[PDB]
Amino acid sequence: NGKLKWKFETGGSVHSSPAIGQDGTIYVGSNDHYLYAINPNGKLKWKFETGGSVHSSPAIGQDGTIYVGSNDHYLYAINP
Template sequence: MASSPAISADGTIYFGPVSGNVFALYPDGAVKWVFPIGVGVFGASPALTLDGTLYVCGSNKVYALKTSSGLARSSWPMFRHDPRHTANAGLPFVFPPTLFSPTLQSDGQFTIDVYGEAGSTYQIDVSGDLSSWSVLTNLSATTFHTLIADPQAASYQQRFYRARMLP
């Protein structure tokens, strides 16, 4: 999970989008319900209002879901905020590079989605054994999401990838 959950007054924990779904969990961790939203916004936290409306992004839409309880009236911490919900945390947020959605395209080309900070430079490395690594490509992210291709992937029985932020 790459975002903060929302906690309701009855203890329900809401989080997502994860694999195209928003989840509601009972306080003991059991699944209360799952709502499909399609492709979500990586790092986007759900927002819960006092009246119990849960807002979440997915598939280029904003969903408003009615829940059983409103926002918890406590000082639980939020992602990048202080415990009183009054300000951003004082440290700068660094979004680590993350690799998602490895896909073998119909033309035989292998692609990976790289998520990271716009304006940052990343090095994508490849390995056949997780011991020795070589550079596949360097990229300067202009948005938080970049699709890269590995034209040599089909030549290998197995291939591992990692992303590193460059200074």
């Protein structure tokens, strides 16, 4: 009904648009260079560091793989 359930702070702007895994993990990039994987309760599952801002929005493969781009020129494939 438009109340905060929770808010996770990253180190920079979040322009990336979140994706949701089969188990409800939320994946989103940040200008702080990381891809984040966050649990449905608001805690960090893991974060993967790229060489640049992650403005790209993650996609999730059939086998759980997370793809997303970065400012650092690469497209990343990361295991869930």
